[PDB]
Each structure stands twice: as C-alpha cells, then as structure tokens.
Write a protein that binds this ligand. Structure first.
Ligand code: UDP
Ligand code: MYC
Length: 443
C-alpha cells in the first residue's frame, strides 16, 4: 500500500472544512492509503478534535501563509488572502516535500480546492492525478468556465448594466453587477486571476468534484458536465459527509423547542460578513418591531455594533450568539425563515432544512446564488435593491412569513429537499459519484 493523497486546502472562508470532511469520508473507507492535508497553521489548528477526532491515515501539514513578520491588518481583510495567493504555488510545493519525506511515499493523487488552478501542472510533474473540488454551486462554476466568452461579448454597455447577457441556461438574463466578482468586475485582483485560470485549467483534471447534486438543476448540471473529463456531484455535503459535531453552548435548540412551528427568524450572514451599521440598526429595529422571535448569529461585539439597549430590550424575544449550530437550527421545525447572505453551504443546509430564505448577498458568488434561489428555484426572495432597510426587511418578512408566497416557497424547497435525499440514497446519483470519486482517489 504505497498510495499517497496530497490535499491542498484554501485557508479562507468555508473551504478547508468541507474539503476535509470529503477527505475524511474517503479516508475511513481506505485505511491503507495515506492522506496529507495542507493548509495554514491557523486553519489547521482550528480543524481539530472534531466529530472524527482523528483518522490514523490523515496527517496535517502547515503551508506558509505569505505574511511578513509582525504583520498587522490595515488595508482590507482581503490583504492576507492576496498575500497567501501570491506565493501559494511554491509554498504548497515546499510543504509537500515534508509529507513525502516523512511518509517516504511519493504523491499519487492531488485533491485540491478548485481555486488551485496550478493543480493540473503540479499533478503533471508529480506523475499524479488531479481531482479539484469546487465547494460552491454548479451555476457559479459554469460562469467561471465561461469567463473568456463572457468577456468577449461584453463592451461598455454590458459593464455598465445597460445590456444583459445570456450566460447561463435556464437563468434570467444577467447584469454585469450580478456576476460572481472577478468575472467581469475587477479582473485585476489576485482572486480574480486565480478563478480565471481555474476556469481554463479544470478541463485537464481527472475529474471535477462538486458540492452539488445533479437534479438541483439538470440544464446547468449537464452543461457543466460537458466541460470536464468528469463531473462528480458529491453533495450536498451536509448529507453526504455529515459531522457528529453538534455544539450548542448557548442552548439555541432548547430555546427553539419553546417556540411554535415556523415562527422563528434565523439570521446569519456567513462566517465573516458584518453588515454596515445602518443595515444592522435597520434589522435590529425591524426585529424588535415586528415582534418575530429570532436567533441571530452575529459576528463581532453586539453591545458595540448593535443599538444601545437592544440586547436587554429583546432578551426574551430572541438570542444573539457569536456562533450557532446552524445545520440543526435550519432543520428545526420552529424556524419559519432564514435571513442569509446566500453562501452556498448555507443555501444547501437550508434546502435540507426546508426553510424559505430571504437573501442579502455581499460578495463572491452570493449574488448569483440569490438569483438562483429567487428567480430560478424560487425558494427565497432577495431584499429590494440588495440592501437591508426597515422597508425592504419588513417587505421580505411578510412575503415569506405571512403571505401565500411564503407557502409556495416552502412547497418548492420541500420538493427540492426530497430530490436531495434521493440523490444521496444508496444508489442515488451522488452516492454513485462519491463511489467513483473514492475509486479514482484511492487507485
Ligand atoms: O452561526 C453560524 C454561522 C455559520 N455557520 C456555518 O458557516 C458556514 C458558512 O458557509 P457559506 O458557504 O454559507 O458562507 P461563507 O461562510 O463561505 O461566507 C455554513 O456551513 C454554516 O453552517 C455555523 O455553523 N454557525
Ligand atoms: O473571498 C472571496 C471569495 O470567496 C470570492 C469568490 C468569487 C467568485 O467569483 C466565486 O464564484 C466564489 O465562489 C468566491 O471572491 C473574492 C474576491 C476578492 O477580491 C476578495 C475575496 O476575499 C474574495
């Protein structure tokens, strides 16, 4: 047993955990194969002693983060990401040498985040297979694959939201501002250059894995499939690679048990985003005004970012936590709506939970995920003008909580949820792609 799987993870956002969970699923199934997980010290330290406390064939290694000694944030929170992207290809090669040296075995398969375009070349010089994992939706991926074409049929009118573009099958016409950032807008930051190159290199992979399921959207999925040697839909991860990890220090679930069905508003804008002060106060004031019970996963100091007295004034109406057991929250019968930024993992967890969504996208692929949930799947609505105001908020809440539209939305998300469960059954489409994925990775 000499196989050695090198796993390259993106240290930012919700990328390393899902990749690790996919890897663990594969690892337990192949106890004789060696797995090496590469990420930054910080991210790896965070990834530890979870549900699967440890797997004997998984070893973690720290890739250099590209930060200068005595580094402090000043420009933007994207600064450290850019610094990481700068020397990531050479730094991953460096740290890879440590794992080969330690295990005494050469890399046979390179599993990477799809963001790592260099995987094809790296896999080639190592005489190894390349299996990239796109952690977001099939629709955003297709958009990245079509970056060059989209740029072609795009002049000034297109860039200035004048004319729209028929970029995706079964999708509304898109406005430049709707495209995942980096495709048409700011094609200059390192992030954009990384995705652009990703789009061009993926066809070289042995197979492209994705956190999705085929029936979520047949047209997009089939279109995506024809761009790669193989497209393996191994999601939704919240079903195919779940974690026993269920932390609820603040008693969110017991708190939800004391509430009636479809009555509570769950709020979370993702792992990092912090809405602007004027939006926070508008949501705060809207919450303690419409009287909906709520659980708000807040990033930062609430006594500092929220109106004075908000906490004490709503101490019985809702809970404000620094972090919450979202997957379980969304599956709880007391939740009637999910105010989200529409990150992909949150969209999939909500689909399994069967809860209508209110979306207020901030960056990346969020805008496209909102169009997907609002105009295509119709399992959620966006807020007027894409911003949170007392007016846009109250409008979205009534539509999802007290209107017939709320029911149609729940009806559709429920059909979708069932399609997901079917894809993950013993012989479902995802279970099968997952078996294929495992074979490719461990052969
Ligand atoms: O209070 C929270 C807030 C977020 N999450 C998890 O954080 C992840 C967010 O990923 P997503 O792709 O939705 O957005 P991102 O964090 O990448 O912006 C999801 O798995 C959520 O379940 C959670 O467990 N508890
Ligand atoms: O964190 C970031 C991020 O996730 C994305 C992103 C863009 C896309 O187009 C996608 O399809 C996607 O899934 C993610 O862009 C970024 C662009 C930046 O300048 C800075 C960032 O920090 C991000």
């Amino acid at each position: 047993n000499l196989l050695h799987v090198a796993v390259l993870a993106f240290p930012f956002g919700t990328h390393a955990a899902p990749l690790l969970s996919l890897v663990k699923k594969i690892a337990t199934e192949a106890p004789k194969v060696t797995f090496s997980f590469f990420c930054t010290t910080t991210t790896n330290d965070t990834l530890f002693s979870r549900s699967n406390e440890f797997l004997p064939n998984i070893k973690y290694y720290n890739v250099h983060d590209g930060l200068p000694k005595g580094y402090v944030s000043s420009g933007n929170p994207r600064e450290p990401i850019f610094l990481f992207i700068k020397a990531m290809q050479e730094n991953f090669k460096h740290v890879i040498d440590e794992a080969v040296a330690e295990t005494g075995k050469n890399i046979t398969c390179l599993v990477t985040d799809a963001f790592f375009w260099f995987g094809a070349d790296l896999a080639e010089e190592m005489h190894a297979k390349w299996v990239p994992l796109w952690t977001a939706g099939p629709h955003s991926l297709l958009t990245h694959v079509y970056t060059d074409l989209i740029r072609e049929k795009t002049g000034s009118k297109e860039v200035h939201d004048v004319k729209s573009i028929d970029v995706l099958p079964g999708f509304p016409e898109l406005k430049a501002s709707d495209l995942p950032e980096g495709v048409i807008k700011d094609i200059d930051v390192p992030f954009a250059t990384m995705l652009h190159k990703m789009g061009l290199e993926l066809p070289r992979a042995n197979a492209v894995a994705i956190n999705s399921f085929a029936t979520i959207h047949p047209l997009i999925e089939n279109e995506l499939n024809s761009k790669f040697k193989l497209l393996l839909n191994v999601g939704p991860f919240n079903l195919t690679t779940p974690q026993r990890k269920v932390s609820d220090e603040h008693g969110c679930l017991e708190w939800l048990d004391q509430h009636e069905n479809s009555s509570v508003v769950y709020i979370s804008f993702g792992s990092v985003v912090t809405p602007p002060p004027h939006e926070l106060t508008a949501l705060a004031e809207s919450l303690e005004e419409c009287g909906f019970p709520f659980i708000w996963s807040f990033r930062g100091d609430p006594k500092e970012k929220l109106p004075k007295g908000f906490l004490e004034r709503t101490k019985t109406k809702g809970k404000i936590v620094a972090w919450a057991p979202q997957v379980e929250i969304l599956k709880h019968s007391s939740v009637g709506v999910f105010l989200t930024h529409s990150g992909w993992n949150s969209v999939l967890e909500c689909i399994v939970g069967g809860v209508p969504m209110i979306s207020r996208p901030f960056f990346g692929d969020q805008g496209l995920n909102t169009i997907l949930t609002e105009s295509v799947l119709e399992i959620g609505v966006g807020v007027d003008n894409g911003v949170l105001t007392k007016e846009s908020i109250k409008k979205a809440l009534e539509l999802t909580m007290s209107s017939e539209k709320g029911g149609i939305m729940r009806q559709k998300i429920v059909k979708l949820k069932e399609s997901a469960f079917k894809a993950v059954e013993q012989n479902g489409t995802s279970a099968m792609d997952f078996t294929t994925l495992i074979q490719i990775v461990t052969s």
